[PDB]
Amino acid sequence: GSSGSSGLAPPRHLGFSDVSHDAARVFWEGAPRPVRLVRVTYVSSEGGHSGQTEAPGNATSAMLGPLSSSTTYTVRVTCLYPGGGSSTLTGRVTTKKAPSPSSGPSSG
């Protein structure tokens, strides 16, 4: 049939800075509880490129990529707590535009 399940409200807010056309930095204000590990998962809207990075429960910031350009990427920072459930901070971010693939001359 179909899969149904309400999503619990996020503990804190997400922040995207130094975003690029092939990458994007995702940082949070830290969860209200201590964690052992953090597995962030990013995926391109309309079902596209997806990945998964790992970071220490202490890490409050992690980069992503290689991402796409002018494309929205659904970032979900999953904080795997040490034997006590887990949370997932959802955050959408629109990557920057990439420079045309056309390569020409240059100057020193």
Q: What are the φ/ψ torsions at residue 56 (nearest 5 degrees)?
A: -70, 145
Count how many Cα atoms sit within 13 Å of the Cα of residue 71 in the half-sphere of its side chain.
20
Where is the chain broken, named by the residue before each break, C–N > 2.5 Å?
A: none
Domain ranges (residues) in the chain? 1-108
Calculate the alpha carbon distances from 36 to 1, 51, 60, 75, 106 in Å: 36, 21, 13, 20, 49
**The domain defined by 1-108 carries CATH number 2.60.120.260:** no
Q: Are 35 and 81 in contact (CB under 8 A)?
A: yes
Tell me how far apart the alpha carbons of residues 49 and 63 are, in angstroms, rounded to a whole number.
16
Encoded tokens for 44: 């391109």
